[PDB]
Design a protein around this nucleic acid. Structure first.
Ligand code: MG
Ligand code: MG
Ligand code: MG
Ligand code: MG
Ligand code: MG
Ligand code: MG
Ligand code: MG
Ligand code: MG
Ligand code: MG
Ligand code: MG
Ligand code: MG
Ligand code: MG
Ligand code: MG
Ligand code: MG
Ligand code: MG
Ligand code: MG
Ligand code: MG
Lengths: 110, 142, 150, 48, 56, 103, 117
RNA sequence: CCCGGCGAGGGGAGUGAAAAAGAACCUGAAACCGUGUACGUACAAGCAGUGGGAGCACGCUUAGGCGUGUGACUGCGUACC
RNA sequence: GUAACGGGGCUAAACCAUGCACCGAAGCUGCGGCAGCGACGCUUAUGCGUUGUUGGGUAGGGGAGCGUUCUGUAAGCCUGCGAAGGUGUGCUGUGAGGCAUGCUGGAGGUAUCAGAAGUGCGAAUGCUGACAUAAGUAACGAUAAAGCGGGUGAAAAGCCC
């Protein structure tokens, strides 16, 4: 059974995250987790946590075996931009976005 | 009803040996181009490669009228500062006679992918004998 | 528009569009460049024309057999139920009662009912007549109308 | 009998000129003014 | 030093094809205990080549 | 057996039992019509051809359906000259089934 | 009265966008571009309605030439022969014949030759 | 109740008609950024369309063939104000 | 950069005299369909048996419509057995469009015939918001410098000692 795990509003761009997601796209769960573990990215930890949560959900809520499970859907989606004002030289203002991230990690034994 | 259009599945391309010994260049070349196109083929389309496969031999033994043996210059550019290159017909014959014929063929065919495909079907030889004996190609007077 | 004659930015210098005002209609919170005013829309009704129209509509009613003529139509007490009963008896719903001498009780009865309306013989209007599909008129009322119209 | 049965005479209620309603109108883009004239601008023309 | 047209999403995607990371090929295994670790880097406990060297 | 006929200016190749779209011929939707405008009747081995139109050839063709075809957006347009036309069109057609080529 | 120019505008946009289906980049999304693209397509369609007939004729003629040359005759001469004969078989049909049933084409060629002689 | 930092966030369980009504809360369009599926696409030059159309996929029908998507190759064609 | 046939090429595929031909326009004709303008026979709210003719168009002039909000018509009618809206799709109109249904949506919409309009946006270096783009690029603010041990904690180059 396909079990959803979401994380919303991760203070990093979805674009950055996508890179790590791709690395573990379609892989076997434990292996994917392992891969995430030794990855050097900060976003790598968040996605790992999400995966863990998903696994836990699968274990408790559904009652599925860990061995059979695969990382199917892993759509990292764009979050709401927190608009902050950065002053620049010569009185110029830039409203810099602080893009957040949605991370949907779904897991199934099929 | 509806107009038929040629299919690479249905298109059968036969094999033709062409002798260029003691024969006028341009007319021969044009004929070759036509053959490649399929302007002789009954099921011709200007969008599908229909024409027959060609082997041409004796590229140096081709005939040119008048001063054309020394007069006709074949120009190509390197892509560099002063990289304009001059090569006379005789000179071309000396080193690589196969080039001239090919160039002529290119001139006489479309500039696109189809043209390129047509060109590919032409296989050029400076000598008299071809290695493509297994295809059983038939010699036509061109 | 409650605002300022202050230019938001200069004419040449700055790269932005040539600004005049925040009041300007091509803006957020700007003018309605062709703003409407409290206006009288009332068309000049020609009196003779009006008369003619009345005549026509009355004729149409007559033709259609929807203009019912009465001698005795009066409600005793200010009572809606009785009026309703009367209507039922004379087979009516959508009705304009036109009376010469205004019975007050009848008028009172006519107030609440949506399909029923009582007007005086001199106090009638074309659209009302058109609106109600079965117009009922008293003899005296009719006479008054005739006098008015000629 | 009704208000939805009564209709005006043809020619009595003319269309009207809506100036500047695209291309299909014909009476559009500039409406009925032309190009770059004094008579073209708003608050334009001259005294009688 | 400024763009003259807006480049496509397509172009950007194409550019990003190389910018995507290389995943670690496989984990390394300690022979005695069975600890999964990074290559040439020690375990979580402090074991290395089937031998505990660091207490932390 | 296949036949060649010109109808409405435009010529069409047709076989027996073939449904071919023609122009709006003002005849009933469920009616059999005969064609003498036949140029060729091809038997298979012995083809028949004579003059502009063949002497003793008649095509028995059943009218199937009348109707309007695919809608086309006739956009007339001129650059920088404030002008844009748009007309639509569906061509009226009569679909014909051919019951038999008669000689 | 004020009219909110929303729903109608959306509807207007919608049809254009649906027309602009299978259009690279902004053409199938961004309206300004999309409308333009649609207009251009329409223009081209108009032109091609009047141009495509000529293309088909060119094709058919070429096919005839190919067939005629195979049989052993030039195209113009063949056409002249046909004219002389008075047989009103158009280019398309001839092309079709060349493609499929070749015996008929051969017969036609023979007839043309006879007409010529 | 589980996950995680006695976090955020989530998933269950529960409320209700509905949480595809969770306080970022009615509907929830477009741009924009995405995943998955479809077909194409890595020797091929240009307002990216159009016309023609190979093939390949997918719906139907009792066969037949039509739709839909894709479109290799190909004729013509230089935005819109 | 061949660069003064458009190119390949050509001793005819040049150039001059003559003829038979074919292509070559959205031209004319063929078949079908739509109108605008007159002539006529009959009539009317003119339809036509017709008949001819006409139908590129900018500024601009004339004529005809559709749709949006509201108003009456309408305490009418459709509508929680699912409105508007959204989103598809199929059909149907000469066009702005209109009708039908799928899913969402979860309460209103409005026939017909009129009336009134802030009525129909793609351009104004338009205005407001949202979101791209350069791009995960430059940058991270003085070139006074850190470095290790132990500590708490989910986690320590920056925090405590
Ligand atoms: Mg002042
Ligand atoms: Mg205001
Ligand atoms: Mg005009
Ligand atoms: Mg001027
Ligand atoms: Mg101007
Ligand atoms: Mg002027
Ligand atoms: Mg033509
Ligand atoms: Mg005109
Ligand atoms: Mg409303
Ligand atoms: Mg807009
Ligand atoms: Mg404009
Ligand atoms: Mg970096
Ligand atoms: Mg750069
Ligand atoms: Mg750099
Ligand atoms: Mg840097
Ligand atoms: Mg600093
Ligand atoms: Mg430390």
């Amino acid at each position: 059974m396909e079990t959803i795990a979401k994380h919303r509003h991760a203070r990093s761009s979805a674009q950055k995250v996508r890179l790590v997601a791709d690395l573990i796209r379609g892989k076997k769960v434990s292996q994917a987790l392992d891969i995430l573990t030794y990855t050097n990215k900060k976003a790598a930890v968040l996605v790992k946590k999400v995966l863990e949560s998903a696994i836990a959900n699968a274990e408790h809520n559904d009652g599925a075996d860990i061995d059979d499970l695969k990382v199917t859907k892993i759509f990292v989606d764009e979050g709401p931009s927190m608009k902050r004002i950065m002053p620049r030289a010569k009185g110029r203002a830039d409203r810099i976005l602080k893009r957040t991230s949605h991370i949907t990690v779904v897991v199934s034994d099929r | 009803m509806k107009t038929f259009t040629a299919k690479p599945e249905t298109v059968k391309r036969d094999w033709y040996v062409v002798d260029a010994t003691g024969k006028t260049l341009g007319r021969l070349a044009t004929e070759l181009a036509r053959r490649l196109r399929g302007k002789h083929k009954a099921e011709y389309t200007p969008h599908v490669d229909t024409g027959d496969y060609i082997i041409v031999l004796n590229a140096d033994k081709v005939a040119v009228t008048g001063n054309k043996r020394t007069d006709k210059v074949y120009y190509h550019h390197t892509g560099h500062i002063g990289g304009i290159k001059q090569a006379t017909f005789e000179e071309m014959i000396a080193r690589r006679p196969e080039r001239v014929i090919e160039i002529a063929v290119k001139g006489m065919l479309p500039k696109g992918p189809l043209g390129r495909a047509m060109f590919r079907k032409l296989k050029v030889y400076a000598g008299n004998e071809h290695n493509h004996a297994a295809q059983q190609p038939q010699v036509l007077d061109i | 528009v409650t605002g300022s004659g202050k230019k938001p930015w200069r004419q040449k210098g700055t790269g932005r569009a040539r600004s005049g005002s925040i009041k300007s209609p091509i803006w957020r919170s700007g003018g309605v460049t062709f703003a409407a005013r409290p206006q009288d829309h009332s068309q000049k009704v020609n009196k003779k024309m009006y008369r003619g129209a009345l005549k026509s509509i009355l004729s149409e009613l007559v033709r259609q057999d929807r203009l019912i003529v009465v001698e005795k139509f009066s409600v005793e007490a200010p009572k809606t139920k009785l009026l309703a009963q009367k209507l039922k008896d004379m087979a009516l719903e959508d009705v304009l009662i036109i009376t010469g001498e205004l019975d007050e009780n009848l008028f009172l009865a006519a107030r609440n009912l949506h399909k029923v309306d009582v007007r005086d013989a001199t106090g009638i209007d074309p659209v009302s007549l058109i609106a109600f599909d079965k117009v009922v008129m008293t003899a005296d009322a009719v006479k008054q109308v005739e006098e008015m119209l000629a | 009998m009704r208000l939805n049965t009564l209709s005006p005479a043809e020619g009595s209620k003319k269309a009207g000129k809506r100036l500047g309603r695209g291309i299909g109108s014909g009476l559009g883009k500039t409406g009925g003014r032309g190009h770059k004239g004094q008579k073209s601008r708003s608050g334009g023309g001259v005294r009688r | 030093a400024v763009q003259q047209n807006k480049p496509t999403r397509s172009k950007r995607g194409m550019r990003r094809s190389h910018d995507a990371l290389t995943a670690v090929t496989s984990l390394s295994v300690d022979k005695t205990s069975g600890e999964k670790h990074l290559r040439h880097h020690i375990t979580a406990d402090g074991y290395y080549r089937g031998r505990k060297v660091i207490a932390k | 057996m296949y036949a060649v006929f010109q109808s409405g200016g435009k010529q069409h190749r047709v076989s027996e039992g073939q449904t071919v779209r023609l122009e709006k011929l003002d005849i009933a939707t469920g009616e059999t019509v005969e064609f003498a405008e036949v140029l060729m009747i091809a038997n298979g081995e012995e083809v028949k051809i004579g003059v502009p139109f063949v002497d003793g050839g008649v095509i028995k063709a059943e009218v199937v359906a009348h109707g309007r075809g695919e809608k086309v957006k006739i956009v007339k347009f001129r650059r920088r000259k404030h002008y844009r036309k748009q007309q639509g069109h569906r061509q009226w057609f009569t679909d014909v089934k051919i019951t038999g080529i008669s000689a | 009265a004020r009219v909110k120019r929303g729903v109608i505008a959306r509807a207007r946009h919608k049809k254009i966008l649906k027309q602009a289906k299978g259009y690279y980049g902004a053409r199938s999304r961004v309206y300004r571009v999309a409308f333009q693209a649609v207009i251009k397509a329409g223009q081209y369609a108009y032109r091609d309605r009047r141009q495509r007939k000529r293309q088909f004729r060119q094709l058919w003629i070429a096919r005839i030439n190919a067939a005629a040359r195979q049989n052993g005759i030039s195209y113009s001469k063949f056409i002249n022969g046909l004219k002389k004969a008075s047989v009103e078989i158009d280019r398309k049909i001839l092309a079709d014949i060349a493609v499929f049933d070749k015996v008929a084409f051969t017969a036609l060629v023979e007839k043309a030759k006879a007409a010529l002689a």
